[PDB]
Design a protein around this ligand. Sequence first.
Ligand SMILES: O=P(O)(O)O[C@@H]1[C@H](O)[C@H](O)[C@@H](OP(=O)(O)O)[C@H](OP(=O)(O)O)[C@H]1O
Length: 259
Amino acid sequence: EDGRILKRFCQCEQRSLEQLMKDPLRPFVPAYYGMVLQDGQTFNQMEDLLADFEGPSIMDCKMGSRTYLEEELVKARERPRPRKDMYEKMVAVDPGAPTPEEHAQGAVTKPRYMQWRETMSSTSTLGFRIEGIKKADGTCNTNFKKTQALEQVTKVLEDFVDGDHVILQKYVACLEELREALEISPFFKTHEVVGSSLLFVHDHTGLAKVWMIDFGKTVALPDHQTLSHRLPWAEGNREDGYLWGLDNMICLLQGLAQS
Ligand SMILES: O=P(O)(O)O[C@@H]1[C@H](O)[C@H](O)[C@@H](OP(=O)(O)O)[C@H](OP(=O)(O)O)[C@H]1O
């Protein structure tokens, strides 16, 4: 559309957006405009987050210690469904990361793949991981499958803010105010948030912002029930590591800001 973007419909994201529009997180999420049909498909219509920017830099971090839903792991034993998809996306990073049985099948299960991807990157050590970068100069990078150690992550962050400090201060101020809103938010408090990202965008005019995006697997907990989002995940507990991720992120960016 026009200052608007169409995203492939899914129910879970619809229901999350319509709730978030009424939540203290509203300022930190893309405006939600409703749905539409076009060229044979159904779409959620969304705010174009880039609208206000001139030649933006852009970074997307997946947030959390766990990236798959629990009924993926408890449904991976009852009726297992191995994927060609994921074996290849795995072998294209580490061959012989597969097991001699996974080898002969050309197939890995989802929780297995998602698990391996969590340990091969910063997710299991920091509770967040860089997924994507596009810089002011036209270059970009989505190859972060082995970005794991604290010093690899900080190098990428350094290159992205590109010595602008200013812009880096602005981003810690966004993340710090995000965190105050997450802590008092009924939506966050009553949802499992897995697979979602923080989108960092900024300009040579010094404009900077962070949004929460991707609510395709943000799930409602049963009545009155809450998460700390800090406590470590164990099958049954539904913990996220979302706020563990955020705390670590804020800490590291402040560390850059001293520098
Ligand atoms: O980043 P990678 O290594 O390419 O892995 C994909 C990525 O983790 C997506 O976020 C995930 O969708 P969800 O997080 O929404 O599950 C998807 O699952 P899919 O292929 O089964 O959709 C993975 O293939």
